[PDB]
Design a protein around this ligand. Structure first.
Ligand code: ANP
Ligand code: ZN
Length: 255
């Protein structure tokens, strides 16, 4: 943590391989105006003023996540390298037109971490283009005046993508570019999850992706964009296999 002026945050990293959250602190300076937006959120350029431990900011207590989902140790984490002092990165806030709940921010970040695991599994098949999903983290902006809630301003953060940002499929069956890898990845996740876990909303710059969406058959978890069986069917029905699907020996779909 740097002595330069900015604002403090409690920073949360989910680690799927131990299935726990890692709680840290950081300092950041975020530009006043967003540089981009989507349907539900605005994105802001931000600079990191360092990452620290959470020892100054005890929990007490019963908010989410529960204590048994929290790692008591935080020495290792991605944040300390990826959000080191001077890093430019992105902060995302929901637009008021506030169905956002605390739990929801953690679900979205966990989701992205789960997709990051699917990315690695895909890559281990040695496709022509490896993919990768960016880290994402929850941040409690503790210096800001609490919401109407009385519980702090929440946001999520992630590394800055540099380049032409494109969305390749939606979370409801749209195929928005001609690229193969994104669709073959979605398909891969559908077949290899035994249809239990489909990753769509494949978007980003080249093959560095962010803000995906998972569908699961029961619709539970993975945020509000989890359209369940319907999401899954809609993907698989508009999907036309390409060469990558074929290299991955996936069951051929004709669209
Ligand atoms: N990590 C990033 N780096 C750089 N630019 C980004 C990043 N994430 C998002 N953007 C840009 O910000 C816009 C809004 O992002 P995002 O909000 O994540 O997408 P979305 O699918 O519209 N759903 P929502 O999250 O509701 O907006 C995107 O369309 C991109 O132009
Ligand atoms: Zn396919």
């Amino acid at each position: 943590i740097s002595s330069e002026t900015g604002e403090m945050g409690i920073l949360w990293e989910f680690d799927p391989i131990i299935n726990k959250w890692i709680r840290l602190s950081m300092k950041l300076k975020v530009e006043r105006k967003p540089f981009a937006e989507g349907a539900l959120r605005e994105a802001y350029h931000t600079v990191s003023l360092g990452v620290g431990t959470d020892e100054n900011y005890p929990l007490g207590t019963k908010l989410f996540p529960p204590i048994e989902m929290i790692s008591p140790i935080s020495k290792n984490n991605e944040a300390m390298t990826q959000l080191k002092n001077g890093t430019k990165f992105v902060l995302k806030l929901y637009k008021k037109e506030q169905q956002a709940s605390r739990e929801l921010y953690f679900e979205d970040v966990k989701m992205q971490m789960v997709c990051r695991d699917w990315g690695n599994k895909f890559n281990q098949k040695k496709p022509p283009k490896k993919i990768e999903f960016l880290m994402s983290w929850v941040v409690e902006l503790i210096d800001r005046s609490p919401s109407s809630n009385g519980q702090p301003i929440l946001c999520s953060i992630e590394p800055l993508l540099v380049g032409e940002f494109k969305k390749n499929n939606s979370n409801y069956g749209a195929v928005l570019t001609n690229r193969s890898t994104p669709q073959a990845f979605s398909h891969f996740t559908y077949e290899l999850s035994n249809k239990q876990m489909i990753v769509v909303d494949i978007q980003g710059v080249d093959d560095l992706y962010t803000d995906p969406q998972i569908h699961t058959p029961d619709g539970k978890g993975f945020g509000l964009g989890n359209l369940g069986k319907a999401g899954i069917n809609k993907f698989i029905t508009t999907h036309k296999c390409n060469a990558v699907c074929a290299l991955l020996d996936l069951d051929v779909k004709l669209g």
